Amino acid sequence: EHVIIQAEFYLNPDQSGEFMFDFDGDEIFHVDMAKKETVWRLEEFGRFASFEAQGALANIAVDKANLEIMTKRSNYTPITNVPPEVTVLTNSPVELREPNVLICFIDKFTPPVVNVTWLRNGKPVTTGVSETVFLPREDHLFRKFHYLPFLPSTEDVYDCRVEHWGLDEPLLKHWEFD
Amino acid sequence: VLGLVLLRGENLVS
Amino acid sequence: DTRPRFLWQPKRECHFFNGTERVRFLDRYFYNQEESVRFDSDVGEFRAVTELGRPDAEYWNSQKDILEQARAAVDTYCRHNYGVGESFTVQRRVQPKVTVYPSKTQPLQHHNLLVCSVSGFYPGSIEVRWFLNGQEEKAGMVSTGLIQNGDWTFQTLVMLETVPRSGEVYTCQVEHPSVTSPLTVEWRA
Ligand SMILES: *[C@@H]1O[C@H](CO)[C@@H](O)[C@H](O)[C@H]1NC(C)=O
């Protein structure tokens, strides 16, 4: 068995939607709205395949349309927030002073809006980082991945800081070697 | 080298 | 922001069996957190999941063209996109790296956990067994389940509860589609 999912969404009042393809729970690509271009999850995916970005920006405009329809039709029922589960880990077992990557796993939440931030020893790290778009879950929710490439060490501690509307305060998840 | 097909989807009733 | 949020979420799904012999296509529409209306290839027509999606189930199902196009998605949409994705997704295989370390259990002969770290592999089907002197430990196994790293790799840890005594050899035996014979790493006390 295998599954391929074309997953879109549109969120009001934020006016932000997403278009992406998903294979067995991994992002094949998404369409960068801002730059109106296709974005592969792994660059060599571009070498076997292609996707025309315009057609997605059409689907989003139609999704914006149907959102406003279904919102009126629902007497303007809003969404219940669902705070995320957060987890920090590393893609490979740690070896000191040998490069690695910290994975922040934001799971089981909605709507698709969070603020994530990497804090090495309390300061925010804005360089080296990458994130994934909101991956669909089967239970109508979302999962997301934030990545910090880092150099393991006994003198450094890190936290992933997630901010969601379904959360009271910001959520810090801790990681230090040991 | 190969092209993927999106699915234009439907319009809701209004 | 204090305001409320309204979420439209359409999902187009392709489900494949016996490689591509049996395909099942679902066009599903989710308002905020509920599924309003859905098309199911195995059903042959749209079907309102909740009351909100009855206006649409009803309108579609009337247009021969909307239904024709829908019914013909297993071919024009699912199978075709399989044809593309196949090389780098269905056929993507990546072999695991397999460490065996003790979980900070440095003591000489007390209770320990033996970690079988298995990282970096694709797809997700994997099997990890522990063997003590060629006999398969079947009790005391603290696994983490699969862990999707989100970069098209996985990891997993299977931990063995044991009291190591000198002269014992524990073997971790990893099977995965990316290797013919099982991968093993041993640990001696
Ligand atoms: C994201 O960042 C700032 C927080 O000051 C603000 O634009 C917005 O309310 C935040 N969104 C959250 C926490 O969901």
Author numbering:
A (entry chain A): 4 to 181
B (entry chain E): 302 to 315
C (entry chain B): 2 to 190
The authors write:
The top five Sm epitopes with strongest binding to HLA-DR15 were: SmB/B’1-15: KMLQHIDYRMRCILQ; SmB/B’58-72: RVLGLVLLRGENLVS; SmD343-57: MSNITVTYRDGRVAQ; SmD361-75: VYIRGSKIRFLILPD; SmD146-60: TLKNREPVQLETLSI. Of all the Sm peptides tested, SmB/B’58-72 also showed the greatest stability for HLA-DR15 as measured by the Stability Index, which measures the stability of each peptide-HLA–DR15 complex as a value normalized to the half-life of the peptide-HLA and the binding score (see “Methods”). The top three Sm peptides were tested for immunogenicity by in vitro proliferation assay and SmB/B’58-72 induced the strongest T-cell proliferation response. To visualize the binding of the SmB/B’58-72 epitope to HLA-DR15 and to identify the amino acid residues that drive a T-cell response, we solved the protein crystal structure of SmB/B’58-72 in complex with HLA-DR15. The structure was solved at 3.12 Å, Rwor ~19.79% and Rfree ~ 25.74%. The protein crystal structure of SmB/B’58-72 in complex with HLA-DR15 proves SmB/B’58-72 binds HLA-DR15, defines its interaction and confirms the nature of the structure is indeed an antigen-specific interaction that binds in a conventional manner. This structure is one of the only three peptide-HLA structures available to date for human self-antigens in the context of HLA-DR15. Knowledge of the structural characteristics defining which autoantigenic peptide residues bind to HLA-DR15 will assist with the design and improvement future candidate TCRs for lupus nephritis as well as other HLA-linked disease conditions. This structural analysis will facilitate future off-target screening as key structural features of the autoantigen that can be recognized by Sm TCRs have been determined.
